[PDB]
Every structure is written in C-alpha cells, then in structure tokens.
Amino acid sequence: MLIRAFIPAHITAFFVPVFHEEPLKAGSLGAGVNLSKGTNVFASIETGTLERHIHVAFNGEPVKREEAEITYYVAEKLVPKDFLGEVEVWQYFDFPNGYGFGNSAGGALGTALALSYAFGGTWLRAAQLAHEAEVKHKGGLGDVIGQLAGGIEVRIKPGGPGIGVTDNLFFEDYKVLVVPLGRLSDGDVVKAIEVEGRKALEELLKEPKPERMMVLARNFAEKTGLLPGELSEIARELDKVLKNPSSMIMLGKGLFALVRDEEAEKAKQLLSDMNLPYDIAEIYTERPKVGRWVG
Amino acid sequence: MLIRAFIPAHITAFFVPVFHEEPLKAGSLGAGVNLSKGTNVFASIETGTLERHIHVAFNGEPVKREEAEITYYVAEKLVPKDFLGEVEVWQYFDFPNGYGFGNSAGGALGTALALSYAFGGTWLRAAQLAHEAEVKHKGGLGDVIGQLAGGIEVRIKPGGPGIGVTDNLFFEDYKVLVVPLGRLSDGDVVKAIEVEGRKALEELLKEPKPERMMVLARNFAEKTGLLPGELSEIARELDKVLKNPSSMIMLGKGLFALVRDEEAEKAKQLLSDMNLPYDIAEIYTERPKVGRWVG
Ligand SMILES: [Ca+2]
Ligand SMILES: [Ca+2]
Ligand SMILES: [Ca+2]
Ligand SMILES: [Ca+2]
Ligand SMILES: [Ca+2]
Ligand SMILES: [Mg+2]
Ligand SMILES: [Mg+2]
Ligand code: NA
Ligand code: NA
Ligand code: NA
Ligand code: NA
C-alpha cells in the first residue's frame, strides 16, 4: 500500500530546446548533472468505497490539481478508471520549485514509477508518460530523460524516453556545490541558444570531460546573454577558489560547480562570508529508485 | 476597419477520426456537406492608445476568453504583439453551438481569415492556424478542412490544410433539410467507427455519388451504435417521404437529408405535424468569403 520513489534533482549546464508537437519527439540537446538530493514520492493506495479519489501533497500540504496538474495528469492516466478507493501522492522536495532543479520532472517521474509499480506497467511507459506530462504542461524538455540517465548526462539526440539518446561522462572525486538564489523570472536568446548550445555540445563530444563541460557551460551562459550581472559577479568571486569554473543553473537564479572536498570548504567560507545560501550534493550516479517503502 | 468573413456550416455524414499529436497531421476521413447557412465573422480594428485589446462576442453578446478560447487562440496569434489599439470580433451563428454544425470551426476560420486579411498573412496560414486551434482545443477534426472544400466534401487523406486531401462530389438539384433537436451529450464505438467509417469511405470512392453517401451514412450511423432510438424513429417516418434516406448529423441530435424542392414541402408538412423543428439550407458550393465589409 505504500510505494516510494526517488528521483534526483537535475541541473542543466547548457541546452538546445528542440520543440516538437509530438511529445515523444520533443526534447532537447545539452548536458547536466544529477544530485543525491532530490524528490521523494510516496504513493499510498487503499482499496474500498463506491468512488475513485486522487489526492496530491507537496511537502506535507495538500495541493489543488491546478498546482499539481502534472502529477495529476500522470495519476489520472495510471490509476484505473474502474478503480474504487483512495490514491494519495505525497511529494517531498530538497529544493524550492522554480529554481532550475527539475522538481516538476521529479514529481512526474516519481509519480509515474510509483503508480505504475502499484497498478501495473513498465519503466519505459512510466518514463514516457512523465516526459509527456512535462512537455504538455511546459514543465521541462530534458529533466526526465536526464534523470533516467543519472550522473553527468549528455543529450546527443533530442526526444523522450525511448526515442532519444543520452550519453554519460566519466568523472572522479567530484561533488556538486549550489548557490540557489531564486527564480530566473527575447528573440535574440532563442537564436543565441540555438547556436551556442549546439556548439557547446559539439565541443563536449570532442572532449568528453566534466572539466570541459563546465568551461563550455560558462561560455554558453555568457555568450547567450542568459547570465545575469548579479550572478556573473558572484561567479567571478567563486571561480577564484575553484579549479573548475562555476556556472549558471539553467533557468534559475543560481550557480553550481563541480568541486573537490577541500575546495568545497573554501567555497563555504567564501560563500557564507557573502551572506549567500549554499548546498552540497553528491553526484547521483545511480538510476531513479522505486519500490515498496520498507525503510 | 471592418472586415467580414463567412464560413458555411458543416455537417458530417460519417467519419473516421485520425488523432495525431501534430496539429497539421491531425484530421479525419469521411464525407459531409456545407450549408448556405453558417457563421458570419466581423473584425473591427481600430488603431490607438497605449495598450493591446482583443474582445470577442457571440451573437451580439460579449464572451469571456474561456468560452471563446478557440477564437482567442486564433486572435492572439494574428494580432501583432507590438500592436496598440482595439480588436473586436463579432461572430453570428445560424445554428446553436454543440449541435454538430461546426460553429467552432466557423469562428476559428472566420477569425483567421478576417484577421489575416487585416494584419497580413495568407489563406493557407489562416486555415492551418484555425485547424490547429480546433485540434488543440478538441474543437473538431474535419470541419475546417471540410469548409475550405465547400459543397459535398470527402476527406480521403487525413490532415490539416496543406497536408490532407479532400475531394468533392458532383450533385444536381439538391438542398439540405435539417432537424436540429439538441446536443448529442464507450470503447466499442471507437472500434466500430474505425471499421465502419473506413468501409463507408471505400464504398463512396467506388460510387462517387451523393445518393450513395446518404445510404452509406445511414448504415454507418446505425452499425456503429451512434444513432439513438429517438432519432432512428424520426428517421423511419422521414424516409417515407424522401427518395434518399435521412441520416444523423454526426455528433449532434438531429438529422439531415439531401432533398428536392417538391419533397421538401412534404417533409415540412410531415415534420411540422410532429412538433419537430426544421431548417432548409442550400448546399454552399463556393469557398469561404472574406473581404472589406461593404454590404
Ligand atoms: Ca527530502
Ligand atoms: Ca567526499
Ligand atoms: Ca501536440
Ligand atoms: Ca446569420
Ligand atoms: Ca430550389
Ligand atoms: Mg517550472
Ligand atoms: Mg463543440
Ligand atoms: Na529536483
Ligand atoms: Na555520469
Ligand atoms: Na457552422
Ligand atoms: Na461538391
């Protein structure tokens, strides 16, 4: 009756949105990282009554379907229509919504895996549906497929689970530092992203390396005009303590960086001494977890 | 400043819904008729102010965007975003909404043609956009493309304007009788329609004839389970006065029939003597009209 799923938070380094009217053919190209910190989804399922009820909650509080539309879209599709009883989905996030961590993808996939497990289905069907729910509601283009890949992911062929190709990079003794400030809140950037994004991808596929990705990221965040002065200034001070250059979480107001244990300390002293908020998450190398909640 | 467009009402004899996530590739197969009675759309456009305003009205009364979503979708896309002034769209219907006459397609296409004319564009782009607006809002699958064909239309290849193929049948001294009662209001019919619909199409393409279409229609409305007993009974009494068999407006509660002037009279005496409502519309053989409203 109690199923739990964990979906790591996903951060994008640089991207190229490939929009497509066909959900499965819709996606993006780019690179990103997955965190040991993310979303935990719990599916409580009780049979009974003369009715079919689906409730959703965000961090302990019930939410209207209107704020939960993506999760609901996923739930209505997986919970049988002849089914009688109560389905409850409790989601817990390690990050605020709208900060670029892909919580909505976490809720979509987490719900799809937990509910497919309880009512029947497969990994692929769950993933496609969560991808589909993301696309149809403008939730995200590569968080779901990115989360399914784990570790440091690279989307080389646009599309949803099943149709697109992602690759993974090897890395050593790396952790993820994040400075989440807030939500990000033209026609030239749509052009710039198209051109810089694809360029970054090509470069990364030339040199498959986490170090290179961060450099290619920083250049991307800057040559597109996406990087705000307020962040750029924080970056200039951050980069002075790290071997690898920090960069902008893609479509949030924050920065992230791949760091080593020792640097991390310095980065803390520095950041905290700037009244700036910071989190440290391990790179989640595994795949999304799903299973009967037994502890 | 005042542009008028006329889109004939469209009635479907039998169909096959071909759903597709790609608007343009979405459509249907089937046959239908266009009426001299339909929708008149008037686009009043005034430049000025420091703001962009779009208002819509149905039969003289202003309507919220929520009831006008399809027209609004079309209007927001055609009215420039840098545009300052007031755009007003007045739609007038010759039939009630939800009765199977395709008013929503009339509003979509009528608005798209009138606004493309005023702000720039082409017939095809207007048609595709109205088709797209219909599909995205579950407005209809073949009314727009059907209205663009005029007369007695046959959709042989599914799709939106541009991509799909429609054919037209020849006919002689035929008029259209309609008995609009109300709105129509499983999984077996989705199966039946798939199989009977395509069968009807194949048969019609064997014998391209309006007489044959009505017979193939009646058989379709019945072998699918779509035809309600209340209509079927009215049909049995109607068919006794007409040479050609009456049939169900597709997805409404009413019937229609191709009739000759003399029969029409009998059909009136009979119908009126049954407390039943009836309309007579000529088969609109032309194409949708658009142009500066000059009378
Ligand atoms: Ca947690
Ligand atoms: Ca460590
Ligand atoms: Ca679509
Ligand atoms: Ca009128
Ligand atoms: Ca006549
Ligand atoms: Mg979001
Ligand atoms: Mg309708
Ligand atoms: Na997340
Ligand atoms: Na990896
Ligand atoms: Na109409
Ligand atoms: Na014709």
Side-chain angles (χ1 to χ4, degrees), chain A residues 1-185 187-190 192-222 224-252 254-265 267-274 276-295, chain B residues 1-185 187-190 192-222 224-252 254-265 267-274 276-295:
Chain A
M1 300 185 126
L2 197 66
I3 306 107
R4 175 262 194 167
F6 171 83
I7 309 306
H10 178 257
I11 294 175
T12 298
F14 58 77
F15 61 107
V16 183
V18 183
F19 290 113
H20 203 292
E21 273 296 348
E22 186 71 14
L24 295 176
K25 291 184 188 170
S28 69
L29 286 176
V33 174
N34 290 280
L35 301 174
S36 64
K37 292 183 188 297
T39 312
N40 278 280
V41 174
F42 296 84
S44 189
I45 300 169
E46 277 195 329
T47 297
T49 301
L50 295 100
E51 295 181 345
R52 184 167 166 292
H53 290 299
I54 302 173
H55 306 291
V56 175
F58 284 178
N59 298 316
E61 166 163 30
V63 297
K64 298 197 298 182
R65 311 173 65 93
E66 301 84 26
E67 308 166 313
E69 284 192 317
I70 281 178
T71 295
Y72 278 99
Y73 179 100
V74 177
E76 284 300 334
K77 299 281 180 325
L78 296 176
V79 176
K81 292 188 181 177
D82 304 313
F83 172 79
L84 298 177
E86 199 176 69
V87 171
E88 298 194 59
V89 188
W90 301 75
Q91 302 181 2
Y92 300 89
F93 309 102
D94 287 342
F95 297 111
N97 290 355
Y99 278 33
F101 299 82
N103 286 359
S104 118
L109 188 54
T111 295
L113 288 172
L115 295 181
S116 290
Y117 178 103
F119 297 109
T122 69
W123 272 75
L124 196 55
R125 299 172 190 172
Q128 298 189 310
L129 172 61
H131 172 78
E132 175 181 304
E134 275 275 86
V135 174
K136 282 180 177 164
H137 296 84
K138 257 60 167 58
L141 292 164
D143 289 320
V144 167
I145 200 174
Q147 286 156 164
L148 288 164
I152 301 187
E153 132 266 348
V154 179
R155 289 152 273 157
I156 64 185
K157 183 177 183 299
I163 288 171
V165 193
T166 70
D167 195 339
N168 272 288
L169 300 187
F170 296 112
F171 62 99
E172 191 174 291
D173 292 334
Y174 270 134
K175 184 162 56 190
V176 183
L177 163 79
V178 286
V179 179
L181 293 176
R183 310 169 70 85
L184 198 66
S185 87
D188 292 334
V189 69
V190 185
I193 299 169
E194 278 289 321
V195 175
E196 290 307 294
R198 306 184 69 74
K199 182 167 73 172
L201 178 64
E202 288 281 51
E203 292 310 297
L204 193 57
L205 298 182
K206 250 68 167 167
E207 195 172 353
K209 298 178 78 226
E211 293 70 25
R212 187 74 175 116
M213 177 186 68
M214 295 291 93
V215 167
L216 285 175
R218 178 47 159 289
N219 172 53
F220 170 96
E222 302 183 317
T224 49
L226 288 174
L227 201 177
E230 75 192 308
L231 288 191
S232 179
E233 288 293 349
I234 300 177
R236 295 191 185 90
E237 288 285 84
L238 182 64
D239 301 349
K240 296 183 174 185
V241 184
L242 307 174
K243 278 156 192 354
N244 287 145
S246 68
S247 195
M248 184 183 114
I249 300 179
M250 275 310 112
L251 303 187
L255 306 172
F256 71 111
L258 305 189
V259 309
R260 305 267 177 175
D261 293 316
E262 265 193 353
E263 293 179 299
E265 296 297 66
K268 297 198 185 180
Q269 294 181 179
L270 186 64
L271 286 174
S272 66
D273 185 324
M274 301 178 78
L276 282 166
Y278 69 73
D279 263 281
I280 293 301
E282 290 300 320
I283 291 183
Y284 188 73
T285 62
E286 294 167 297
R287 48 185 48 160
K289 301 280 181 33
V290 76
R292 189 190 58 178
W293 179 245
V294 69
Chain B
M1 300 185 126
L2 197 66
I3 306 107
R4 175 262 194 167
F6 171 83
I7 309 306
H10 178 257
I11 294 175
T12 298
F14 58 77
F15 61 107
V16 183
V18 183
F19 290 113
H20 203 292
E21 273 296 348
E22 186 71 14
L24 295 176
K25 291 184 188 170
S28 69
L29 286 176
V33 174
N34 290 280
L35 301 174
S36 64
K37 292 183 188 297
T39 312
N40 278 280
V41 174
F42 296 84
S44 189
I45 300 169
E46 277 195 329
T47 297
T49 301
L50 295 100
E51 295 181 345
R52 184 167 166 292
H53 290 299
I54 301 173
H55 306 291
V56 175
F58 284 178
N59 298 316
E61 166 163 30
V63 297
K64 298 197 298 182
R65 311 173 65 93
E66 301 84 26
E67 308 166 313
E69 284 192 317
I70 281 178
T71 295
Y72 278 99
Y73 179 100
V74 177
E76 284 300 334
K77 299 281 180 325
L78 296 176
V79 176
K81 292 188 181 177
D82 304 313
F83 172 79
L84 298 177
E86 199 176 69
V87 171
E88 298 194 59
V89 188
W90 301 75
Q91 302 181 2
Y92 300 89
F93 309 102
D94 287 342
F95 297 111
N97 290 355
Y99 278 33
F101 299 82
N103 286 359
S104 118
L109 188 54
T111 295
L113 288 172
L115 295 181
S116 290
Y117 178 103
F119 297 109
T122 69
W123 272 75
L124 196 55
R125 299 172 190 172
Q128 298 189 310
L129 172 61
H131 172 78
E132 175 181 304
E134 275 275 86
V135 174
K136 282 180 177 164
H137 296 84
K138 257 60 167 58
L141 292 164
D143 289 320
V144 167
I145 200 174
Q147 286 156 164
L148 288 164
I152 301 187
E153 132 266 348
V154 179
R155 289 152 273 157
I156 64 185
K157 183 177 183 299
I163 288 171
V165 193
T166 70
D167 195 339
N168 272 288
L169 300 187
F170 296 112
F171 62 99
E172 191 174 291
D173 292 334
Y174 270 134
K175 184 162 56 190
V176 183
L177 163 79
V178 286
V179 179
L181 293 176
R183 310 169 70 85
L184 198 66
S185 87
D188 292 334
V189 69
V190 185
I193 299 169
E194 278 289 321
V195 175
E196 290 307 294
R198 306 184 69 74
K199 182 167 73 172
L201 178 64
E202 288 281 51
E203 292 310 297
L204 193 57
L205 298 182
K206 250 68 167 167
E207 195 172 353
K209 299 178 78 226
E211 293 70 25
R212 187 74 175 116
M213 177 186 68
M214 295 291 93
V215 167
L216 285 175
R218 178 47 159 289
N219 172 53
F220 170 96
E222 302 183 317
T224 49
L226 288 174
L227 201 177
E230 75 192 308
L231 288 191
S232 179
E233 288 293 349
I234 300 177
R236 295 191 185 90
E237 288 285 84
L238 182 64
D239 301 349
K240 296 183 174 185
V241 184
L242 307 174
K243 278 156 192 354
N244 287 145
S246 68
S247 195
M248 184 183 114
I249 300 179
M250 275 310 112
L251 303 187
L255 306 172
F256 71 111
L258 305 189
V259 309
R260 305 267 177 175
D261 293 316
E262 265 193 353
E263 293 179 299
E265 296 297 66
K268 297 198 185 180
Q269 294 181 179
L270 186 64
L271 286 174
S272 66
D273 185 324
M274 301 178 78
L276 282 166
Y278 69 73
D279 263 281
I280 293 301
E282 290 300 320
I283 291 183
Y284 188 73
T285 62
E286 294 167 297
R287 48 185 48 160
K289 301 280 181 33
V290 76
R292 189 190 58 178
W293 179 245
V294 69

